[PDB]
Amino acid sequence: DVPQVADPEVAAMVRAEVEGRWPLGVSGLDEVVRYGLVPFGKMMGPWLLIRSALAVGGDIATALPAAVALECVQVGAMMHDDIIDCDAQRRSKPAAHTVFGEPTAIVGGDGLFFHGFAALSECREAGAPAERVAQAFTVLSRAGLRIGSAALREIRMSREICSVQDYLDMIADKSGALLWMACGVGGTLGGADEAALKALSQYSDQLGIAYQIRADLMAYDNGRPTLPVLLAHERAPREQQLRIERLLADTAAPAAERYKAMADLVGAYDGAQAAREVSHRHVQLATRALQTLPPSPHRDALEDLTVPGRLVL
Amino acid sequence: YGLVPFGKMMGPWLLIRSALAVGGDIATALPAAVALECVQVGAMMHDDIIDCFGEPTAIVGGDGLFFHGFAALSECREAGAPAERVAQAFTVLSRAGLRIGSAALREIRMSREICSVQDYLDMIADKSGALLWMACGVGGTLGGADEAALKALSQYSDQLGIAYQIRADLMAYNGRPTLPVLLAHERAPREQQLRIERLLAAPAAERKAMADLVGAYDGAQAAREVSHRHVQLATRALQTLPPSPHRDALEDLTVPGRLVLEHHHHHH
Numbered sequence: 001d002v003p004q005v006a007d008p009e010v011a012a013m014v015r016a017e018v019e020g021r022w023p024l025g026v027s028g029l030d031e032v033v034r035y036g037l038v039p040f041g042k043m044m045g046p047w048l049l050i051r052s053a054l055a056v057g058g059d060i061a062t063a064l065p066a067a068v069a070l071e072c073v074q075v076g077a078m079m080h081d082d083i084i085d086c087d088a089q090r091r092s093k094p095a096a097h098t099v100f101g102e103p104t105a106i107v108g109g110d111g112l113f114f115h116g117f118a119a120l121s122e123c124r125e126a127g128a129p130a131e132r133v134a135q136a137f138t139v140l141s142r143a144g145l146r147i148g149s150a151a152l153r154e155i156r157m158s159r160e161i162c163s164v165q166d167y168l169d170m171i172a173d174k175s176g177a178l179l180w181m182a183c184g185v186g187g188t189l190g191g192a193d194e195a196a197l198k199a200l201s202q203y204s205d206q207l208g209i210a211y212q213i214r215a216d217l218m219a220y221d222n223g224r225p226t227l228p229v230l231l232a233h234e235r236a237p238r239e240q241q242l243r244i245e246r247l248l249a250d251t252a253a254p255a256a257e258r259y260k261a262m263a264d265l266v267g268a269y270d271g272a273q274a275a276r277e278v279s280h281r282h283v284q285l286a287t288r289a290l291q292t293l294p295p296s297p298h299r300d301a302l303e304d305l306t307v308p309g310r311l312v313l
Numbered sequence: 314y315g316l317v318p319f320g321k322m323m324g325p326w327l328l329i330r331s332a333l334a335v336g337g338d339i340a341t342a343l344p345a346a347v348a349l350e351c352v353q354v355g356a357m358m359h360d361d362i363i364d365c366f367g368e369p370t371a372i373v374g375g376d377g378l379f380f381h382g383f384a385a386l387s388e389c390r391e392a393g394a395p396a397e398r399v400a401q402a403f404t405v406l407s408r409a410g411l412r413i414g415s416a417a418l419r420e421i422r423m424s425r426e427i428c429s430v431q432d433y434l435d436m437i438a439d440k441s442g443a444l445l446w447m448a449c450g451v452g453g454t455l456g457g458a459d460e461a462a463l464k465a466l467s468q469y470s471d472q473l474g475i476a477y478q479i480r481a482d483l484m485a486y487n488g489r490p491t492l493p494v495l496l497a498h499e500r501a502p503r504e505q506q507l508r509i510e511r512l513l514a515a516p517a518a519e520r521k522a523m524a525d526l527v528g529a530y531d532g533a534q535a536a537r538e539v540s541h542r543h544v545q546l547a548t549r550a551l552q553t554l555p556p557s558p559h560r561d562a563l564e565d566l567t568v569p570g571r572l573v574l575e576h577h578h579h580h581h
């Protein structure tokens with residue numbers, strides 16, 4: 001009932017730390033590093049890492065440099081993904097390669113990666129036992145391999161019908177691994193036992209799937225297939241399924257007429273609502289996994305992240 | 314001669330020799346060499362893009378290979394490595410990649426103009442010297458090296474990277490600056506300094522021209538002697554370590570002990 005552990009101000013404390021490390025006016029490699037970091041934004045990843053560490057009894061001083069590490073790793077990956085990405089959102093800020101040139105944007109992503117690795121190395125001096133610091137690097141690295149594999153698969157799997165599970169596995173690596181990178185490393189430094197880490201893993205995967213579905217739904221309120229498209233295909237009769245596959249199969253058709261053809265078929269078979277119910281089931285599975293963790297304001301914070309509109313990546 | 318030149322001067326032999334020279338165990342250096350392999354290859358895949366096979370893989374694969382290095386390095390604890398040494402390897406490895414990134418930035422921003430002799434040396438000390446320190450620092454750290462030894466591998470790593478990148482400039486004989494051109498700038502009066510800078514600043518192929526003007530003003534010769542000074546500093550740094558066959562193996566690598574193929578392997 002009553003909180004027996006505290007609830008700190010995670011969001012602003014992170015921003016102060018990253019700004020302290022790369023303040024306004026930095027030059028050299030830190031200038032391109034800072035460009036990827038600013039505007040700071042919500043930083044739900046670093047927020048999730050510290051909350052996961054505190055949910056298992058960890059230290060703020062230990063989890064804080066790991067939260068900085070993750071931001072640098074994710075921004076470095078995002079800086080490199082922008083180079084290979086083609087369609088840009090109007091809201092999305094100008095890509096670093098468009099601003100600094102493509103060669104500089106690659107070096108910048110590398111500086112972001114190694115600044116992350118350097119920040120995670122500071123956890124030893126922060127108080128974490130060297131056995132835990134090394135396990136944090138292992139959890140972080142494997143998550144970094146799933147997000148990179150998904151980015152390549154996003155490029156390859158597009159414009160073709162895939163199995164519903166094949167989409168689910170990819171979005172678990174694109175979105176669930178972003179959270180598992182936060183929850184796994186945060187829980188590890190926090191001293192979570194083996195059962196707690198698996199729960200945070202289940203929470204990360206289930207919430208990552210749900211977030212992606214919610215993103216797939218925004219066009220249904222890049223011309224790539226999404227879960228509402230797959231669910232509509234599964235429900236559509238054979239004649240319509242034939243159409244859905246050839247629409248995806250050939251990368252030589254105008255974008256507008258492609259989109260409207262997909263949007264009409266999704267609406268005809270309630271693909272949007274079906275995607276909502278799938279997302280809803282995985283949200284409840286994420287909250288179920290949380291119950292393994294001990295009750296705390298931090299565990300309440302992770303469950304609040306499952307509320308629609310609260311999580312933003 | 315001596316130990317015959319083999320080509321492809323890479324960390325796997327620097328890392329293991331560095332680990333054993335300070336008393337390390339072979340059971341850790343082998344999976345560590347695999348970890349270093351990943352990070353060095355990923356650095357190569359990115360180096361191939363900046364000096365203009367597929368763009369997504371060359372980047373993302375280069376990115377993922379960094380993760381393999383750090384994951385495998387931590388994995389070495391199950392091989393029997395002390396967790397405290399592994400943690401320090403993370404710090405050593407991370408700061409080396411920061412030097413490689415900082416150097417590659419200078420390469421793009423220094424092109425087409427004369428830099429100071431000191432600035433070029435610092436750049437390649439972080440570009441290619443850190444690449445060797447990646448092997449020495451990790452191997453020595455996992456090997457149980459003292460702080461004085463780790464520093465001893467540090468000047469050895471840099472001074473070695475300095476020399477061979479100069480040797481690369483010597484093999485040649487964007488308008489990127491090289492040491493022979495730079496030392497030619499020091500001796501020439503303004504009349505020839507003015508010439509040198511315009512060539513760096515028209516088609517690149519014909520500007521065979523650059524080769525003509527470096528030969529007319531003794532570009533190539535000047536850089537050789539600077540290389541040999543760093544050769545000795547690398548050998549001096551090794552004397553801090555205790556004598557062993559591992560120490561001898563590192564000491565020959567200062568004289569050319571691998572082919573031009575090493576510079577082709579730094580490339581390829």
Ligand SMILES: [Mg+2]
Binds near residue numbers: 360364
């Ligand atoms: Mg190069």
